[PDB]
Structure formats: structure tokens, C-alpha cells
Design a protein around this ligand. Structure first.
Ligand SMILES: OC(O)(C(F)(F)F)C(F)(F)F
Length: 256
């Protein structure tokens, strides 16, 4: 079967990390949309204009609003992309056949939206040469960040080629986890987000979202399906592109 995959990058990244995976899925017969979220990739906004993870998710929400009645998509989110999935599923659960988490945060419905991110900062507290700044938007002080190049090299793109790591140094932008805004956000609902099928893809070779955090998330909010990819790194759509496309074909053949 063919599905329409909507690929959702992580913060400080853009549609471009999917540049290898999107032609592979299309060569399998699938339709693929690779969005730039607010102030990400070649989106015209800067991060200081964005006051929350919900506003940051506007390109995905606008995309889902434009789907004609009865068209469903499979959302695929990498790293912080799981939070954009949770936001989208609370507005458009009928339009989501399934959600695939790719070395991604897995929000739940029993704790606050920031919960999984609070646990990530405890498991991975040293972001090496990542720099931080603050800005104010709608009376809230938000901590922005720009991922350090050594963190990019060693923890995110560990096993990627120098031409893939070069794209990350050239294209990663200032972003924000909006953690303090997520902490005071209403909880993801059981009827929207809680109702969708969740497929959890990960590698125990991930150098930022370490096995303790990912195994902690699997036990915290049980996925409908778990796939463990052997080897690769945090960017499995670059180091294990073929393997991710095979898993996504299986999800397409399972969830309607
Ligand atoms: O997903 C990241 O890019 C961040 F957005 F959380 F910073 C990470 F991989 F660096 F953690």
C-alpha cells in the first residue's frame, strides 16, 4: 500500500534532513511532504517571533487543515518532532492514520507537555558548545539555543558523512525547546493525541537520546509498535535511510 507521509524535522533543523529519505519513500510509490516549521529551514520567520511550541508547529497545523475530508497522513517526527505530533494530533486526530517517532520524544497524556523534555535534560545535561540566548514574546522569557558544531559532530551526526555534517553546520538555525512554555501548557488529551497509533523507532547507538531515556520513554507511555534499528546514529534518516523506509512501508501496510 501507498501512504502520504508528512515528515517533521526537529528544532534548529528543517525539511532538508529528510533529503535522503523523501526520494526513497517516493521510489516505493508513496507521497511525501517535508515541511519547514516556523523559523526553521527556509521559512521566512526568525525564532524571536515564535512564542510557543504550538506557534512553532503552525506549518504542520496549516498543512493538516488543508487536507480534504477523508485524506489521512502518517506523521513521522524526529527528535523534538514528537511534540509537534502531539500538538497536531489534538487538533487533527481524524486526519492521522498513525504517528512514527524516529529517535523522538514521546509526550504522554498523564504528565505536563514538558515532562519528557525535563527527563531529557536530566539524562543529557551537557550540550557542549551549544550557545544560549533569551528573548521575550507575549510576556514570556524564552530560552533560545543554537546547537554547537561539536555537539552536531559527536552526538547528532556521529556516524554521518562529512557532506551531511557540512549541511548541518550550514543550515541549522537558532531555535527553542520552549520548555517553560510547555510546562504551563494544558496537557495533551486522551481523545486526540492518546487515540492515535504510535510507532516508536530508535537505535541504542543514539548519542544524545541515550538508551536510558528512550527505554524510559517506552516504559512511560507504551507504543503500539516498537522498532529498534541496529547501528546508525541519532540521524537514522541519514545513516540508516533504507531501514527507515522499510519500517515506514510496514507502517503504511499496517495503519489505515
Ligand atoms: O533535537 C535536537 O536538535 C534539539 F533540537 F533538541 F536540539 C538535538 F538533537 F540536538 F537534541
Amino acid at each position: 500500500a501507498f501512504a502520504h507521509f508528512v515528515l517533521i524535522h526537529t528544532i534548529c533543523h528543517g525539511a532538508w534532513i529528510w533529503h535522503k529519505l523523501k526520494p526513497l519513500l517516493e521510489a516505493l510509490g508513496h507521497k511525501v511532504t517535508a515541511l519547514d516549521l516556523a523559523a526553521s529551514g527556509v521559512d521566512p520567520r526568525q525564532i524571536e517571533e515564535i512564542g510557543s511550541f504550538d506557534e512553532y508547529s503552525e506549518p504542520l497545523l496549516t498543512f493538516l487543515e488543508a487536507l480534504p475530508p477523508g485524506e489521512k497522513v502518517i506523521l513521522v517526527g524526529e527528535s523534538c518532532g514528537g511534540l509537534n505530533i502531539a500538538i497536531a494530533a489534538d487538533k487533527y486526530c481524524e486526519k492521522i492514520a498513525a504517528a512514527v517517532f524516529h529517535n523522538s520524544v514521546l509526550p504522554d497524556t498523564e504528565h505536563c507537555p514538558s515532562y519528557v523534555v525535563d527527563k531529557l535534560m536530566e539524562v543529557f545535561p551537557d550540550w557542549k558548545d551549544t550557545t544560549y540566548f533569551t528573548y521575550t514574546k507575549d510576556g514570556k522569557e524564552i530560552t533560545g539555543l543554537k546547537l554547537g558544531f561539536t555537539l552536531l559532530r559527536e552526538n547528532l551526526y556521529t556516524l554521518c558523512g562529512p557532506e551531511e555534517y557540512e549541511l548541518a553546520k550550514m543550515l541549522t538555525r537558532k531555535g527553542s525547546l520552549f520548555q517553560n512554555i510547555l510546562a504551563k501548557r494544558p496537557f495533551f488529551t486522551k481523545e486526540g493525541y492518546g487515540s492515535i497509533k504510535k510507532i516508536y523507532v530508535w537505535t541504542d547507538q543514539d548519542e544524545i537520546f541515550l538508551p536510558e531515556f528512550q527505554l524510559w520513554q517506552i516504559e512511560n507511555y507504551k507504543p503500539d509498535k516498537v522498532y529498534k534499528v541496529e547501528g546508525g546514529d541519532h540521524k537514522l534518516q541519514l545513516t540508516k535511510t533504507k531501514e527507515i523506509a522499510e519500517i515506514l512501508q510496514e507502517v503504511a501496510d499496517t495503519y489505515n
